[PDB]
Structure 1
C-alpha cells in the first residue's frame, strides 16, 4: 500500500480497546440496566388507570402536571443511553467485517441481518425521543389554545386526555425499553461465534 508508517498502529485503540470496551457493555451493563428498569416498572404510579388521579388540576376561564416530568426524569436518561450502546454495537460489527470475498460470505450476511435489526431498534428509540419532546409541545399548545377557550368545555377537558395518555405511553416505552436491552444481547450472544469470526480464516493452498 506504501502508506505512511506513522500513526498506523493508532487504530488499535478503536479496533481493540474500544472494541473490548463495547464487549464489557453487552454482558455486564445491559443486564444490570434491566434490573434497574425493573425498579422503575415496580413503581405504583404506572399502574393507576384512573383519569382524575393521573391528571393534575387545571384552572382556565396555568397549572401543569409535574408528576409526568418526574417520570420523564427517569425515562429520558435510560432511553437515550441505550441508543449510544446500540451505536457502539453498530461500530462493534464494523470492526468485525472481513475483507471482500465471494465464498464464505454467510458470516457477512449474519452481520448484515443483526445490524439491520440494530438500526430498527435505533429507529424505535429515536421515535421515542421525538415523542418525549412532543409531550411538552402538544400539552403546551393544548392549554394555550384552551386558555382562549371559555364557553367550550369540550376542548378544555380533552387537554387532560394527552395527560393520561402520557402515563400509558411512557410505561409502554420503559416496558419496550427493558426488552430492547435483552433483545440486543440475545441476538448478539447467539451468533457471537460467527459474528466475531465470520470466516474462520482458513485458506489452503494445495494448488
Structure 2
C-alpha cells in the first residue's frame, strides 16, 4: 500500500522501540525481577509459619444466650502483602504483553514451507499466552479476596449467633496468605520461564525463515 514518509517513520519508530524494549527487558529487567521476587519470598513476612499470627481481631459482640459492631478493619498483614504483590503481577502482565507483541511482529509472511521457525514462534506464543491467563487469574482473585471478606464480615455482624462466619473470615485471611506466597513464587517462575524459553529459541524467534537460500530459482 502507498505509505507516506511520515507513516513509514511512525511504523519504524514503533518497531524499533518494541525491539529495543524487548531486548532490554529480557536481558536486564528479567534477572533483576527474578532476584527481587526471590529475596521477597525469602523475606520473613512471606514466610510466616504460625498462621494464627495472621488472624486479626473481629470485634463482633458475641451474643449472650437469653449492641452494635464497631468498625471492622481489614487484616493489616494481608493488605500490606497485597500492596507488595499487586505491582509485581501488573508489571508481569505488561511485560508479557510486550513479549507477545514482539514475537507477533517477528512472525514472517505466511508461506507454504520452512514453517518450523514460525512453529517455534507459535509454541513460545502459546506459553506466553498461558502465563498471561495465569496472571489474569491472579489479578481477579486479589479482588475476590476483598469482596468475599467484606461479605463474610457483613454476614458475621448480621448473624452474631453464627460463629462459622467468623471462622470463615479468619479462613479467608489464611487462604489469602497462602495464595499470595504461591503467587509470588509463580510470578518469579513465570519470569524465569520466559527468560529460558526466549533465550533458548531466540535464533529462530528473531529469524524464523532463516538465512537466504542459494536461490536455485
- Could you state the TM-score of these two structures normalised by the residue count of structure 1? 0.94
SS in 2 for 1:44: coil
SS in 2 for 1:7: helix
Return 143-152 or 170-179, whichever deviates more: 143-152
Indicate if the aligned counterparts of 1:41 and 1:175 stay in contact, CA closer than 8 A: yes
Q: Provide structure 2 residue ranges, at least 5 long, that are not aligned to the other structure.
A: 63-72
**Alignment-derived partner of residue 206 in structure 2:** 196
Indicate if the aligned counterparts of 1:118 and 1:184 stay in contact, CA closer than 8 A: yes
String of CA shifts for 1:26-81, please: whole Å, max 9, x gaps.
Answer: 01001101111122112212222323211111110293311111101110000110
Indicate if the aligned counterparts of 2:153 and 2:165 stay in contact, CA closer than 8 A: no
String of CA shifts for 1:136-182, please: whole Å, max 9, x gaps.
Answer: 10101100011112222222222100111111110000011111110
1:5–1:12: structure 2 CA closer, same or farther, 3 Å change rule?
closer
Indicate if the aligned counterparts of 1:90 and 1:118 stay in contact, CA closer than 8 A: yes
**Alignment-derived partner of residue 141 in structure 2:** 131
1:164–1:15: structure 2 CA closer, same or farther, 3 Å change rule?
same
SS in 1 for 2:112: coil
Return 45-54 or 112-121, whichever deviates more: 45-54
1:5–1:65: structure 2 CA closer, same or farther, 3 Å change rule?
closer
Indicate if the aligned counterparts of 1:128 and 1:173 stay in contact, CA closer than 8 A: yes
Indicate if the aligned counterparts of 1:46 and 1:168 stay in contact, CA closer than 8 A: no
1:148–1:9: structure 2 CA closer, same or farther, 3 Å change rule?
same
Indicate if the aligned counterparts of 1:79 and 1:177 stay in contact, CA closer than 8 A: yes
Q: Provide structure 1 residue ranges, at least 5 long, that are not aligned to the other structure.
A: none
**Alignment-derived partner of residue 31 in structure 2:** 31
CA shift at 1:4, angstroms?
4.5
1:104–1:48: structure 2 CA closer, same or farther, 3 Å change rule?
same
Indicate if the aligned counterparts of 1:75 and 1:174 stay in contact, CA closer than 8 A: yes
Return 34-43 or 191-200, whichever deviates more: 34-43
Partners in 1 of 2:210 and 2:166 — Cα distance?
65
Question: Are positions 1:99 and 2:109 aligned together?
Answer: yes
1:56–1:15: structure 2 CA closer, same or farther, 3 Å change rule?
same
Output the aligned Cα RMSD. Answer: 1.7
Partners in 2 of 1:4 and 1:43 — Cα distance?
55
CA shift at 1:2, angstroms?
4.3
Partners in 2 of 1:192 and 1:178 — Cα distance?
21
CA shift at 1:6, angstroms?
4.4
Indicate if the aligned counterparts of 1:41 and 1:174 stay in contact, CA closer than 8 A: yes
- Could you state the TM-score of these two structures normalised by the residue count of structure 2? 0.90
Partners in 2 of 1:5 and 1:193 — Cα distance?
31
Question: Are positions 1:59 and 2:59 aligned together?
Answer: yes
**Alignment-derived partner of residue 153 in structure 2:** 143
SS in 1 for 2:5: coil
Partners in 2 of 1:148 and 1:189 — Cα distance?
56
